[PDB]
Nucleic acid binder design. Sequence first.
RNA 1: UAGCUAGUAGGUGGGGUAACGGCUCACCUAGGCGACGAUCCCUAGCUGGUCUGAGAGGAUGACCAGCCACACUGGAACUGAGACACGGUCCAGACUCCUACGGGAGGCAGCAGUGGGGAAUAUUGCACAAUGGGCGCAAGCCUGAUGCAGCCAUGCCGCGUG
RNA 2: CCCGCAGAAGAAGCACCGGCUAACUCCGUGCCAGCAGCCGCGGUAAUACGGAGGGUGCAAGCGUUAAUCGGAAUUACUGGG
Lengths: 85, 66, 123, 122
Amino acid sequence: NIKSAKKRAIQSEKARKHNASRRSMMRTFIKKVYAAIEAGDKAAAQKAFNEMQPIVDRQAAKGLIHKNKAARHKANLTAQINKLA
Amino acid sequence: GVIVIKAQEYRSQELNREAALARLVAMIKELTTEKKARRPTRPTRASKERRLASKAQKSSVKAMRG
Amino acid sequence: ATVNQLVRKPRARKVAKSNVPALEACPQKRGVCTRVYTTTPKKPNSALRKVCRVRLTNGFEVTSYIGGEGHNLQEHSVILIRGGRVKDLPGVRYHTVRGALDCSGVKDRKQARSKYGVKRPKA
Amino acid sequence: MIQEQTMLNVADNSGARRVMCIKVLGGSHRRYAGVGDIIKITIKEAIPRGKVKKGDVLKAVVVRTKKGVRRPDGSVIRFDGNACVLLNNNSEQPIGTRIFGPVTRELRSEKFMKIISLAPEV
RNA sequence: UAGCUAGUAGGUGGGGUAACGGCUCACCUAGGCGACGAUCCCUAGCUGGUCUGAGAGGAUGACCAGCCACACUGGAACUGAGACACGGUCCAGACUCCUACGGGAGGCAGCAGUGGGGAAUAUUGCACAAUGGGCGCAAGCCUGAUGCAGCCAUGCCGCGUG
RNA sequence: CCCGCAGAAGAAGCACCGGCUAACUCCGUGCCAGCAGCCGCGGUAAUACGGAGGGUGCAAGCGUUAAUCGGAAUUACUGGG
């Protein structure tokens, strides 16, 4: 099995950990958002939300995130924030 | 083939002695007898009897050509 | 014909049984062919039909007829089997093909040479 | 250090699982058995498609001992099990191929170098 | 083969996927399915069609074509438009291979070929001429797909042996 | 594919032949040996066994075995008791 495709493994592993770092980064901001949600402070949560807003978009446009999930997160949270308003 | 016999049914030597005889020589005799012959047995009159069953059937079965 | 239960229970078509349990889809089978002997036909006949017990490659043990006026079988020397009854020996349902793997064809035959596996004498 | 009726485990892929000592070869009235020695054993547990069956008797050489073996310096290597590998009952040839679990360094005895080559560690 | 089932039946809400959904959880409700056959067991890839038959039907599904499924066994995920993947990777397992005994390699249900099994089924051939696919504005470049030759009367058809 | 050279030169076996089912006699072994899809043939004139000649059928194939359907209204709805 002497093939040049063996480079596609090491190349992909570089991309694997790269997206991996980007993935948990998103979850952290969600937990940052959910933190204030546990507290109930709307302004703090609003601050938490407005800080990750520009981040999720630059990850949505980067190709790692499809538009749907990006739009979905902005929906549920903000509506729930109105509950904690 | 070490043929071993043990005799315990008696008190004296001579009786345990003679009992060992038949337990050996007769046991030798019984283990030597075998089947012999007679096979096969041939039909004597069936070779005559069956003739009727064939000719009676052949003669009667002649109702064919139309 | 009381079509009501016909819908409840359709016309149960009987399954077509076999005649050669040697092995379906397999026209022929090889066997070690042990036990070489001869028996006697049924009531209407009188002869000495030579037969053999055959252990199949399928694990089965069948009895077949040795067709010919001269054989060279030795309780071994694998042969080939085929379907076909004789209506003379109750129990047999297979024929043994002369001119087989390890069983020569009959010697000194002229007619039906395609049968008995005997090669046509061109000389 | 193995003796009579000691239940061992097979380290090869021969087909056995649970063996039992029926006799330690070599030397008259010898009691124990070193980690790199041979003993007559039997099969008390085997897999369905194994090359050998239950109740069969043949030779085998031990490899791992819970008592372990010492070293020329003084250090010792104990195991958490007692294992062995099957041999040819008349030619000493190891019938099993894939050996599991590490073996000893002292077994560089040429007749087991075959085993050491297929041995995983040590 | 007579009762079967408990994320199983549904609702609310969080989460989750490209997207609907017990897809996944928390709570409430105890229901749902079953003689028009459930569950359980065995068997089998499906269809267009193919063989036969007056028809209705019975059998079959190699090959030409479309769909699904698998890639040594089983499990998993990443990358990516798209796989949770034949000629990628990681783990476990089984069976082989090399050795420098440290430490690594291997997956023909791809084309040929090999052993075995079996009643029985072929060359370890030539080339991108042709059609098609992959990169590029373009030129070229690659392909045992494919196009051909060979082995065999296996079948269909045709002619000859005056 | 088309054209020329050429000795009629280099090119035929297989099954069956009692009825079903086209197609026969003689000799040999004599319920022995053997044939057979079916019924059955064979005990010294065997058209069925074996050989020979002749005949019939088919054809670069011919027989045998295996498989499905049909015949089979022997699963009958078409179309049975």
